[PDB]
Amino acid sequence: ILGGTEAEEGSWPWQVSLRLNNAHHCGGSLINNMWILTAAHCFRSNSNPRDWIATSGISTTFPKLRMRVRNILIHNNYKSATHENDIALVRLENSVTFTKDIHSVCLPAATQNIPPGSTAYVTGWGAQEYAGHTVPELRQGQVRIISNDVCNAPHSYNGAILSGMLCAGVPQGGVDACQGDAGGPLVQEDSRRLWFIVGIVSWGDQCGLPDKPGVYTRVTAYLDWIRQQTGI
Amino acid sequence: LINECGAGPDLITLSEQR
């Protein structure tokens, strides 16, 4: 996360770290007591459940809970060349005991309204500037949804943002997800104080460039896939 | 919280209050 702050314990109870060969690699979100929603490209080099561990807690050095992984499911039509359908599910070896500090985020409704300029929070242990290292302490940053068409401007991504994707950032830049934040959530609170995952951190041109906002998997576009795989 | 979803800390503490 660029331009954000350290999250407090319990702020983001669905956030998890995914560790490959005992190092933080990607973020994810609990969507029930067995399942974590994340990005496909996290598993491009290794998709062996035995080599992955999930953790909960604001700290990756001193986690509150370590959880073994049993299954990794990559979207059937994930295409790395165009970043399309960059989405994955991870099923845990044992159910997680839900508490105030550790529990699930809501999936959005198929008709969820997500206006441009609307506020959202992105969370993770990613780098604090382009080319930096990951951090041990969870960070959060506040950003605004940017319309797909504006994001597709010739001076921006110029047609690369597709319908199952979404963009977010701030006009002057400096606030964004970075390398190490992939698979983490982009969340909005509704007026009943429930939080919904609208995006999954996916890709972008560097990090924090004003003309290049963060690109995220649009979760509404994958609801039917998720329900099939998980019953959620 | 429980097998429900989306609850921040303030929502949980509220629901605990009698």
Residue numbers in the entry:
A (entry chain A): 187 to 418
B (entry chain B): 169 to 186
In the authors' words:
Transmembrane Protease, Serine-2 (TMPRSS2) and TMPRSS11D are human proteases that enable SARS-CoV-2 and Influenza A/B virus infections, but their biochemical mechanisms for facilitating viral cell entry remain unclear. The protein domain organization of TMPRSS11D (and all other HAT/DESC subfamily members) consists of a small cytoplasmic domain at the N-terminus, a single-pass transmembrane domain, a Sea urchin, Enteropeptidase and Agrin (SEA) domain, and a C-terminal SP domain. The TMPRSS11D substrate-binding cleft consists of pockets of amino acids surrounding the Ser-His-Asp catalytic triad.
To study the TMPRSS11D ectodomain with its native zymogen activation motif, we introduced a catalytic serine mutation, S368A, which improved protein expression levels (eTMPRSS11D S368A). However, overnight incubation of eTMPRSS11D S368A with nanomolar amounts of active dasTMPRSS11D produced eTMPRSS11D S368A protein bands migrating at 25 kDa and 12 kDa when SDS-PAGE samples were reduced, and a single protein band at 40 kDa when the sample was not reduced prior to gel separation. These banding patterns suggest that the cleaved eTMPRSS11D S368A protein contained its SEA and SP domains, and the dasTMPRSS11D protease successfully activated the eTMPRSS11D S368A protein sample at its LSEQR186 ↓ ILGG zymogen activation motif. We repeated this crystallization strategy for TMPRSS11D with its native zymogen activation motif, LSEQR186-CO2-, and determined the crystal structure of a TTSP interacting with the N-terminal (non-prime) component of its own zymogen activation motif. This structure explained why dasTMPRSS11D was capable of cleaving and activating eTMPRSS11D S368A and explained why TMPRSS11D can autoactivate when overexpressed in HEK293 cells. Using the eTMPRSS11D S368A crystal structure complexed with the LSEQR-CO2- peptide ligand, we mapped the S1’-S3 subsites of TMPRSS11D, providing an opportunity to rationally target the TMPRSS11D binding cleft with peptidomimetic inhibitors, focusing on exploring S2 interactions in the current study. Interestingly, both the eTMPRSS11D S368A zymogen activation motif (yellow) and dasTMPRSS11D zymogen activation motif (magenta) adopted an α-helical structure oriented perpendicular to the face of the SP domain, whereas all other TTSP zymogen motifs were β-strand structures wrapped around the SP domain and/or the electronic density was poorly resolved around this region. The TMPRSS11D SEA domain was not resolved in either TMPRSS11D crystal structure.
